Amino acid sequence: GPHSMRYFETAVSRPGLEEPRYISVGYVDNKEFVRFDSDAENPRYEPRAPWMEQEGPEYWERETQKAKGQEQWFRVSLRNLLGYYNQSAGGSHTLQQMSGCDLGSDWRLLRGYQQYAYDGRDYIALNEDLKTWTAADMAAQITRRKWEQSGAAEHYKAYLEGECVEWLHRYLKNGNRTDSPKAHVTHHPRSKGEVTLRCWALGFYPADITLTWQLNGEELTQDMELVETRPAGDGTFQKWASVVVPLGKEQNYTCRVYHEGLPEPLTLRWEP
């Protein structure tokens, strides 16, 4: 499939002489697999999936050393950002980073990513060509000028085309999977001769899913209520969708669940 790796990094400054807090989280196919947190007892990268436990202490020490590098680069960046935006130093700011690659079923790089945000807002981002930067901001032009002059884009391009891709592959071989949704519909009263029908999908992995309601073969995109997909806490997910229908006409409505673990999409109705 469209395999992916991401590293999501955050440094948050704190008032009163404290060093910023730095957290890095690695994701393979949207699932967390490593994590580093500078607030920990003995700060180091730790495995967050079982299939990472096969890696030797060299791997951890190497990743842990990179994190100490990032921590510092983030810390100096925060200081600079404060100066760029003319802000005072009593306060609390954030710098976030997103890095990673998308691979095809052929194991070939589809797209590489390198993005930063300051205080939750787009700051600078490497474009899809991997040579140019889009700065969202007056202050980010300062940064863009520096990185164009130094050829920083080249460095990030090499990481995204090489190391990111090779390691994603290694991690996939290390990790060789779906859980199909169990679906049902519930029935809920309303006033004025109307009823709510709710289509539930439960216990599914991965998180991606589509739920539709049909009236006589026509999709009800318009007045369908939909919750955001939510974690169950056991590694699986939950979602539901609902429509308000006329009382006594419930059998005319069909729910369909689309999920990649399913042989066929599920098709179901209210079953009293």
Binding site: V76, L81, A152
Partner: peptide, 10 residues
């Protein structure tokens, strides 16, 4: 395997 940011910083 994670990124190792190059200087210059931001």
């Amino acid at each position: 395997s994670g990124p190792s940011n190059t200087p210059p910083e931001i």
